Design a protein around this nucleic acid. Sequence first.
RNA 1: AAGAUAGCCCAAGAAAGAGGGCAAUAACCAGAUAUAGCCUG
Length: 1301
Amino acid sequence: KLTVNAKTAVVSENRSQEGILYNDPSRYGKSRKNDEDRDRYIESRLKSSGKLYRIFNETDELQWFLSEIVKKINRRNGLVLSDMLSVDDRAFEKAFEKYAELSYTNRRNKVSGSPAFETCGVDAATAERLKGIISETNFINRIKNNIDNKVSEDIIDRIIAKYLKKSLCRERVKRGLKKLLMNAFDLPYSDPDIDVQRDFIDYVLEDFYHVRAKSQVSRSIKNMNMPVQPEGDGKFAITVSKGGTESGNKRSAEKEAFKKFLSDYASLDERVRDDMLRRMRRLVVLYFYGSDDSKLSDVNEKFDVWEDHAARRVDNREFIKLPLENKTDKDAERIRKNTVKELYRNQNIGCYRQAVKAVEEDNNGRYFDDKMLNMFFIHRIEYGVEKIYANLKQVTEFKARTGYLSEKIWKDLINYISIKYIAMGKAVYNYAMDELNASDKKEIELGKISEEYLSGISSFDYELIKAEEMLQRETAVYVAFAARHLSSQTVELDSENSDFLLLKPKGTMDKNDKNKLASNNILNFLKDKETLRDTILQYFGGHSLWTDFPFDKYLAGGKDDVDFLTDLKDVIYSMRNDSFHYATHNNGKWNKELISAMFEHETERMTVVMKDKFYSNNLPMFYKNDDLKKLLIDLYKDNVERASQVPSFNKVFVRKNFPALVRDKDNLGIELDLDADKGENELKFYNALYYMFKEIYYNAFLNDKNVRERFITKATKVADNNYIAENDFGQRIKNIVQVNPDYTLAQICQLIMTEYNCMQKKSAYKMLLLVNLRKAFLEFIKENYAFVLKPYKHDLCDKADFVPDFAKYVKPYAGLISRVAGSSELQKWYIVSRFLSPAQANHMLGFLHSYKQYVWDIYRRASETGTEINHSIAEDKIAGVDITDVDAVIDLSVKLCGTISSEISDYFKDDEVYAEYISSYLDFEYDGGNYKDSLNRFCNSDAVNDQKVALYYDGEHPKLNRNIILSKLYGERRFLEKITDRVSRSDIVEYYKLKKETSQYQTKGIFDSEDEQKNIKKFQEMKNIVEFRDLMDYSEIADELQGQLINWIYLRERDLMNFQLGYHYACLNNDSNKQATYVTLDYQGKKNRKINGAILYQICAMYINGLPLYYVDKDSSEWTVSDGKESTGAKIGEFYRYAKSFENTSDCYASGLEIFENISEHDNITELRNYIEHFRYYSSFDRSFLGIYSEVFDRFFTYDLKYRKNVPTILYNILLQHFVNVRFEFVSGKKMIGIDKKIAKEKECARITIREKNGVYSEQFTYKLKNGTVYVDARDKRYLQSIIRLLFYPEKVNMDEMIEV
RNA sequence: AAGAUAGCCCAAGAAAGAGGGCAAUAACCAGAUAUAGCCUG
């Protein structure tokens, strides 16, 4: 990358913008580059490549022969341009550079022929010498100097396709080089249209001296800008470049014409938009089908553009003729693909020149009146064709069809209109809707640009927006999951009442018969009202922990546990569509005293929980309680707010290598001296030490002052004295600490990891961070916790005897308790996070960390560049609440969500119900009597030899399995049954046999032989099965697949609002006919208010929880205002009743949405959105995850190609994160158009599936041994089978054929 | 309907041009919640 030293940004001063280069990290006054320094920086980066410049870049006999030819050409005395042009003590370097500039200038000024050196400051005699140096004869001699071999035309072809430098990979340059090489090797060859001197040699000189980048790159950076900027009259519009050159001025004029198109197209009169789309459609038909196409003959024919679109798509006409296939020879296929790309380019050039001519000659009403608008679209069309072939992955016949290309370009032009209206709405929503903020103003004005942004938008401004929108979208996913988990055990929904958050309180009656309950009254759906409180308290750790809590104090009067459930439902709902940007918000409808009291009650157990984890992790088995007490107070006296982008403990201390690293004398030298319980006690110790070090790592190590100082000195050792990398890594650390000496260790890690950072996850600075953190932690242990070096096995004390005086030394939650009591917003974060799975709560916490670090980094870079920035996005607060408080709240949920009660009665009604529930995942040979006795006999039966089954029983009762209860609270039972097989006796037999085989080398960590490593992996796989750990893995994968779908839902909903905002903002600001209430609402009710820019206010009100909407009520037929808390679906209906008077349209809500989507599928989009967010998949299983992702790819992101075309890759990445590699196959399925209430028709749909044979394979783990290295499948066939079932259910496939081994 | 594995902005450009930028835009990278599960780099 050219600008690898620096970063770019866009700054705006007084409605004028400038792209800048700046060094990072740096200080104000030393970061932003001035004009001259920007110019010399680019120039310096270009000249730093001249001496390594080579025409060619960089096992089989032929492939290895081609590499030897390239190397010999690139060697000394070969084609080394720096040696050739610096001859005679560099006396001719300036003349050669001047020649290269004149050669380029002659091209863009259309002067034929190579420049004469006499015009490069050189006499006629020297000119003859220089011309000879860069002649074909001399190039041939340099090429031949190190080669004494025979080649062919095909060999030269393969060398050019595989090794020619990218900057030289243009058709005429490649043909010039081929002609040169054939002449060099005395092979007969003819290419009469090509001149070796002008087409290859002269161009190589232009490329060697970088004459294009030298004269253009710096100016192109300075003229960069944002998508939207204010105009003179304080209106947002798409940004138009300033131009400055002949081609730049024409380009800006075309862009101004399209800006007028966006203004004129925003018309409620659909006939106006219909006519404009028809003219754009005729440009597409002209481009691909010529001026004599039948749809261009009659200028006044109002043909259906969409029916023409469908007709062309199935046309068999060929855009180019593809060459025949090759006799796979991958070198031959690359040559063929390059030939195919040139065929596309030549035909695309022909189509362009023909369309430009026909637009100028035979318009007369066919196209747009503005010629610059026709040219803008023709340039878009040519660019769209190039987008298709420039990154062609494989030559296919369908992609060579004219109808495929014309219709891809048609949707491409509509895409461009869609993203520009969305871009306009983005600027309007964030910067021109200030008076949405709750106020006492009786008259407000929407759509006026806030004062801080009238001078324009900077790139830092949009980085802040991204940070906020990312966290908002991530939080919307967990709101949905919290609602799902709360509903899963309390209510049973139906298809008509499938959104738990929209159920109504127990007193809600039917509107048309007040004698009956409302259909959505929560009473109609309760699974068991008499156990409702205990069912809810399962998610608060079990009701046994609440026997002292005065529920009746808060549920007094006629309130009961149904109001308890309703209050929790109301908390979660108040966070849905709760905008971080506009406060409507801090006074919840629910019982704030009850929720606050439950929070305080939960903080009171936190010290007990954290010290219990020391006990449960067997730390008091190897260390003195007094030494552990000291550590507990150190770690948990204060709530620790973790920073993002710090390497995780598990990456610094890999668990596999942990026993060996602990015993190493150079690290810690810990040896535990220990009968039958020997190997089991060593395993307990290393597991205990691993948990203790992890807690130390996060709660004491990372923030220690002495640790940071010694980290810096050690990391910069090699710098002040792999060896290549540690020197550069050390110098980077030195630069960081010089810029700011107060940077924390986390901030140094963040800055390093920044420059360390392709859309696809890759299958098979960071290490030096890991190594230096590892070394610093070991010394921190030796300096501050020396007692850990001397473990001693002794009997475990009683759980209640382990540091019972812990609470009296620490009070970490003292201040937070009162702040939650007075903050409805804090209570929202509490309840939403509290109802997540432990893994989800952890992810939510990580997203908060990434948000805080992002905002801090934006303001850091804005400050060093001297860029004034509005602080609407705070570094320390979110939605008016301290991020530190939100962090502590989510962290409490993370810990308590994973703390399962020890009482079976907290989750089940007796041991028999629990045993039967276990039978859904374990086949303990149920005879038919009672499940409890069947399980007890199973565990008491012989497994292998002298070993009983055991595992699942704890004395007189079945053993409480942590993974079983977590799947009950947070997982989906029917889903897990349908994708997995129950644990069997043979599983347990194989478990115990592998436990015995590995019992002698289990804690060796890193192993000697290949058979030892494979048997260890096999035992770990069997342990995961018998402990139901694979069950949790599948549940998390499903949660990640479902979470991404919900993420996409709120991505689309944001952009639908932005499209509507930008479109109606453009309509408000054009001269088209607009009715009174579209512009101004004058509401005269008791809550009177005058709304200027009413359409914009009402659009945003549809999407913001708490923003009231003005409408004419159904039953009263009079104007009213809502409280703003009604559902999105209710607000859409209300918006229709606000616009129902509109006389220039039948549907204001849908105006312009033909650009955003296919209107005929609008209700199908709503159905898919509801299907996902209401978790209908887990109740019906009518579609597969692959089928849901397929429909999203097919029609959920019609509004923006960059989201649609990444949908399959995102799915591929999620699976690869769990070490599953899948190979996609894109085929056909079915989808409905419309919803029956009875006009729905069926149509073809995109179907993403997996290749039938060898479509799924596991990633390989690289397992280092003592001497060698072995590769083992990360996931066995049984794991891959459940992944396939997860993706395909209810569809069944041949998994023996699909899985590759 | 689709056959994905980007998209946009600046520059260049008709004997085409094809040089730069993007935490701005999604993805990517990173994140450890619980007891042998995310190795390697």
